[PDB]
Design a protein around this ligand. Structure first.
Ligand SMILES: O=C(O)COc1cccc(Cl)c1
Length: 298
């Protein structure tokens, strides 16, 4: 079925939980043996969220190459993403090693450091220009260059230096600050405005390594971001945009990391975002300005 009227049909029939459970039943199951080795216990934030062996990112390090991160490679859309957990106190150095080794330009952060009164990830970037960070275990230095705080999100320019070679690179940090503690946003307008800002920066393009996207576990909000991006790219590429099947795209992405999209509410929101985004893309370009306005980012 098409998307927007499949949507109206699930809403009127109140069957989002059943649609979502079908996806959970059909999703791939692949081994994650490296993640479960005892030496890696303090490298995993959640015991039930692990990367598959076949798609895990390997650190370039002969002692222990493990990080809880997965490469999602979308063949038709010609986009790749790295999805990862929020860094832990003992993995912040590994995180920036991965960014360096995979040649990523952008990092997309969809959570706040504290939510629901508990810590959801480590403070893994510097908050003041004059107070840079040094990661001794991986020999990297990280400096804040500039910060632009808007109503729904913040963009930071960072400098990452490999202290072994004295090479330096510019990394862009895209921080969505307004996802509610419970549930999903009422309107996808600010999330789509945010996605388009990431796109406009070059961070998702083939001349760079894959963008790194994370939330707390790296499957729920993170899954919503790449599912919406990939579906919109396919609708632009194809002769028949109504042939994009969001459930089939989601199952393809779940070949590469478990558990993407964590609730039936997140699934419904993903439909909403793709539907609204397909109107602003057209051929209607003015819709982009509309989202910006409706997002009240100032
Ligand atoms: O389902 C659960 O309770 C555990 O898995 C997660 C933990 C934190 C965040 C997210 Cl999205 C999932």
């Amino acid at each position: 079925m098409e998307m927007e009227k499949e949507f109206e049909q699930i809403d009127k029939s109140g069957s989002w939980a059943a649609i979502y459970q079908d996806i959970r039943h059909e999703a791939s199951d692949f081994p994650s043996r490296v993640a479960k080795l005892p030496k890696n216990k303090n490298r995993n934030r959640y015991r039930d969220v692990s990367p598959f062996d076949h798609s895990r990112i390997k650190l370039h390090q002969e002692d222990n190459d493990y990080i809880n991160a997965s490469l999602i490679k979308m063949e038709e859309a010609q986009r790749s993403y790295i999805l990862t957990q929020g860094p832990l106190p003992n993995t912040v150095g590994h995180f920036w090693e991965m960014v360096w080794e995979q040649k990523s330009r952008g990092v997309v952060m969809l959570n706040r450091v504290m939510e629901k009164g508990s810590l959801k990830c480590a403070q893994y970037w510097p908050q003041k220009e004059e107070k840079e960070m040094i990661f001794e275990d991986t020999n990297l230095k990280l400096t804040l260059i500039s910060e632009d705080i808007k109503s729904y999100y913040t963009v930071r320019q960072l400098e990452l230096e490999n202290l072994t070679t004295q090479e330096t690179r510019e990394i862009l940090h895209f921080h969505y600050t307004t996802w509610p503690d419970f549930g999903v946003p009422e309107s996808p307008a600010s999330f789509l405005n945010f996605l388009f800002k990431v796109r406009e920066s070059g961070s998702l393009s083939p001349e760079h390594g894959p963008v790194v996207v994370h939330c707390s576990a790296g499957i729920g909000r993170s899954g919503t971001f790449c599912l919406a991006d990939t579906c919109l790219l396919l609708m632009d590429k194809r002769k028949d945009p109504s042939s994009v099947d969001i459930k089939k795209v989601l199952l393809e992405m779940r070949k590469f990391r478990m558990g993407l999209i964590q609730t039936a509410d997140q699934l419904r929101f993903s439909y909403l975002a793709v539907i609204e985004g397909a109107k602003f893309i057209m051929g209607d370009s003015s819709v982009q300005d509309q989202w910006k306005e409706l997002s009240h980012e100032d």
